[PDB]
């Protein structure tokens, strides 16, 4: 009947193909804004003073960068944590010099992905599922917000955020190892265990289910035509697969319940990523990694060397070369 | 009960002994607040100001008068809200907007307290008024400002100029400009020019750093604070070794600001995840499918295909 | 020591720029993705068999029925993400196929690095940057950083070379 009622019925319909919902009205236009700025700025952005030391940095395809070296340059350090939109700038040849589109794209992309998580709640509630997909999607959201928002707040500049490009990502990672020693940090090792265990468990489950498919086709055609869509028959003998796994390793490390197996798959890599999401946020506030410098000492008092005392030399080599034209006072980068 | 809790702090500021201000001259000092500034157009500025740099959110609070006046506001407001809700009931625009159950009430409080934790983290890392530098230590920008001021006071008394000392790349080694025209220190504290500390503000004039005051008006207690803050800058480690990661095991130091900030950021982020748990589960339990899709009545096989 | 090996590749070989290593990280991290996706989907579009909210107690291991609504999860991920699976044969086979493809396509690049056919510097940006001074891409910062790795760590990493660099020879950075 009424305009608002018909509009709400359309926007909470479930028959339009890509669902919208009520978080969708912030998810859709803001991410379209971020995409439409990023595609332009990856192609035709003028060089950007990332350092504030009057040295512009080329990042776009038109100025002698390929797909790997192409990147959206982050904002200058003199800009700091100041909110710097288009309308506060003088011209569009002045906004793009001082780290323009990074400030726009990051603040758009974060508001996009949080509302995308809300949308993943909302469509599950509209269909009648149980609502915990957004809880699992909270992990890469945290991993994005730690490098795009939390760490530049901690360092006090938007310069030290991750550059939006392939060859810029590694120049973020190596200098982060230089100043913070991420490898000697126990949260990061928990995240390494998370991603490696996630790959192991994915390959293991996809092996042990594909190894028990019930023969329903021939041996000339595809082995994927044995599953007609929307049936009620369990296409993999989970009893035989669990018996094979129990003969393979252990009978008390069973996980005979399929639901317990799926809880374990849902909770291994998510909790793996959450600890690195905390670890970046802790290293943002200058709470450093480990430090085993000059630990092994002989009976006289001289200094022996270990693998930590080689990683110290590698991090010295990175540190005395990162930001080569800025640092004068001997610390605090 | 929370309103009386706020009025306890108001009474402790106004009548009982006093509160340690960090902006009294001649070093920080305990004083008695006489005129708490309770201007509504000033106090409701901070709740609306932009949460980015320079402007800042309520972490940019500076005056103990403003702090105690805002607590006067909260002490009146919470008592008024209590007298409101004891005698009123919720109105139907809120009786249909909410999920009224047990776990839902937990779900709202978890998200609220997660926001509380994030605000506490950004308070304890940046502020130096409510968390004074003499008690908790120097802050992030304060360390860099202290280092630049210490080396300027060092190199001034030897013969080199403080103004015409051109740095490596043309910019000033010691003094340069802001983006908005002020006169500040150089190096990498151009990201930290928004700093306002009591050891630096008497040396700060209308355009910023007064060159005449940096020639003539340096105080010995300011020299001591600058000499100790660059020594005890917040550069921790998990095994409690101070400095950078490329530093030998010299000083057992981690600042308490780092522990407060990191611990409350993690403990707020987990409450946020708990809110994303319970706000889904409560509305699902109120709807009636918190235990799974029923096999007979299924909401998908009635709908149209999408093609 | 594995950390020393990682910084060894990062400072001598520049193992970062290897497309085979890009394949490897894509395989590993996409498998870690799809594990979490499948685990948070299957037990979330679950059926109704038990009475209490503890849904773990409502599974017969000897069962001829299903335990998760394939139609519902298909409609879910079709309306959020776009493309969505419809064949749980192919789903578990794809979970099989992703990380082994990543690890084999990393092994080929480790072979190519063993023969010292490293993914070190290009032609074009280097010959352009030797001519025009102010170029300074993240690429030409990573190369100038890896040189700082390789000139500092070597003199204590490999003593059988018998080299002691003077401090003037080291990449200093002009008093950082």
């Amino acid at each position: 009947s009424s305009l608002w009622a018909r509009f709400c019925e359309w926007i909470t319909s479930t028959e339009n193909r890509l669902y919208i919902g009520w978080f969708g009205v912030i998810m859709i236009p803001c991410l379209l804004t971020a995409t439409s700025v990023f595609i332009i700025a990856f192609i035709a952005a003028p060089p950007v003073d990332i350092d504030g030391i009057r040295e512009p940095v080329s990042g776009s395809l038109l100025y002698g960068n390929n797909i790997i070296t192409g990147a959206v340059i982050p904002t200058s350090n003199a800009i700091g944590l100041h909110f710097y939109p288009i309308w506060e700038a003088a011209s569009l040849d002045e906004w793009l010099y001082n780290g323009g589109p990074y400030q726009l794209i990051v603040c758009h992309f974060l508001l996009g992905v949080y509302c995308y998580m809300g949308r993943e709640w909302e469509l599950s509630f509209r269909l009648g599922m149980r609502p915990w997909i957004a809880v699992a999607y909270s992990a890469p959201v945290a991993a994005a917000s730690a490098v795009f928002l939390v760490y530049p707040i901690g360092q006090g500049s938007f310069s030290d955020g991750m550059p939006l490009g392939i060859s810029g990502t590694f120049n973020f990672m190596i200098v982060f190892q230089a100043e913070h020693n991420i490898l000697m940090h126990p949260f990061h090792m928990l995240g390494v265990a998370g991603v490696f265990g996630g790959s192991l468990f994915s390959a293991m489950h996809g092996s042990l289910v594909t190894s028990s498919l019930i023969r329903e086709t021939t041996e000339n055609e595809s082995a994927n035509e044995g599953y007609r869509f929307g049936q009620e028959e369990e296409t993999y003998n989970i009893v035989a697969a669990h018996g094979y796994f129990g003969r393979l390793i252990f009978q008390y490390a069973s996980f005979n319940n399929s639901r317990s197996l799926h809880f374990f798959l849902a909770a291994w890599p998510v909790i793996g990523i959450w600890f690195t999401a905390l670890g970046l946020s802790t290293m943002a506030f200058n709470l450093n990694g480990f430090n085993f410098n000059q630990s092994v000492v002989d009976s006289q008092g001289r200094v022996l060397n270990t693998w930590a005392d080689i990683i110290n030399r590698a991090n010295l080599g990175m540190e005395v070369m990162h930001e080569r034209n800025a640092h004068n006072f001997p610390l605090d980068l | 009960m929370l309103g009386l809790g706020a009025w306890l702090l108001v009474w402790k500021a106004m009548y009982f002994g006093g509160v340690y201000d960090t902006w009294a001259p001649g070093g920080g000092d305990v004083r008695v607040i006489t005129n708490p500034t309770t201007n509504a157009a000033v106090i409701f500025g901070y709740l609306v100001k932009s949460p980015f740099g320079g402007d800042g959110w309520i972490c940019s609070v500076d005056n103990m008068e403003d702090i105690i006046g805002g607590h006067i506001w909260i002490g009146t407001l919470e008592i008024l809200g209590g007298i409101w809700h004891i005698y009123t009931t919720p109105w139907p625009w809120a009786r249909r907007a909410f999920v009224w159950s047990g776990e839902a009430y937990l779900s709202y409080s978890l998200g609220a307290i997660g926001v509380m934790g994030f605000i506490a983290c950004c308070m304890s890392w940046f502020n130096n008024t409510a968390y004074p530098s003499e008690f908790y230590g120097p802050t992030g920008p304060e360390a860099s400002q202290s280092q630049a001021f210490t080396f300027l006071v060092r190199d001034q008394r030897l013969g080199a100029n403080v103004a015409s000392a051109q740095g490596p790349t043309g910019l000033g080694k010691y003094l340069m400009r802001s983006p908005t025209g002020e006169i500040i220190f150089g190096g990498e504290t151009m990201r930290f020019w928004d700093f306002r500390g009591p050891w630096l503000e008497p040396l700060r004039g209308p355009n910023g750093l007064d060159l005449n005051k940096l020639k003539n008006d340096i105080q010995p207690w300011q020299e001591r604070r600058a000499a100790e803050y660059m020594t005890h800058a917040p550069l921790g480690s998990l095994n409690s070794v101070g400095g950078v990661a490329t530093e030998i095991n010299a000083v057992n130091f981690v600042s308490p600001r780092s522990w407060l900030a990191c611990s409350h950021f993690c403990l707020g982020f987990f409450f946020f995840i708990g809110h994303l748990w319970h706000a889904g589960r409560a509305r699902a339990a109120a709807a009636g499918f918190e235990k799974g899709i029923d096999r007979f009545d299924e909401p998908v096989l009635s709908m149209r295909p999408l093609d | 020591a594995i950390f020393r090996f990682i910084l060894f590749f990062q400072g001598f070989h520049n193992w970062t720029l290897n497309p085979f290593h890009m394949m490897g990280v894509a395989g590993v991290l996409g498998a870690a993705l799809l594990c979490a996706i499948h685990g948070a989907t299957v037990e979330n579009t679950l059926f109704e068999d038990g009475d209490g909210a503890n849904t773990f107690r409502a599974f017969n291991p000897t069962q001829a029925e299903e335990t998760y609504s394939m139609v519902t999860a298909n409609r879910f991920w079709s309306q959020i993400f776009g493309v969505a699976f419809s064949n749980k044969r192919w789903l578990h086979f794809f979970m099989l196929l992703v990380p082994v493809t990543g690890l084999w396509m990393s092994a080929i690049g480790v072979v190519g690095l063993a023969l010292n056919l490293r993914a070190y510097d290009f032609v074009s940006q280097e010959i352009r940057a030797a001519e025009d001074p102010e170029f300074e891409t993240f690429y030409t910062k990573n190369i100038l950083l890896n040189e700082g790795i390789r000139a500092w760590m070597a003199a204590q990493d490999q003593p059988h070379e018998r080299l002691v660099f003077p401090e003037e020879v080291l990449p200093r950075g002009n008093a950082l």
């Binding site: 193909r17 192609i43 395809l61 038109l62 390929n66 797909i67 007609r228 869509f229 929307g230 049936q231 | 295909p305 999408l306 093609d307 | 139609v71 298909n74 079709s78 776009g82 493309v83 969505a84 419809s86």
Partner: peptide, 30 residues
């Protein structure tokens, strides 16, 4: 010259994404 090749490859990848989303086979029932 090669910038046009780069742009053509990126736009073609996005086009295949578009046709994969919208012009798929309908996942049909029993």
């Amino acid at each position: 010259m090669e910038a046009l090749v780069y742009t053509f490859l990126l736009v073609g990848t996005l086009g295949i994404i578009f046709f994969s989303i919208f012009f798929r086979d309908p996942p049909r029932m029993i």
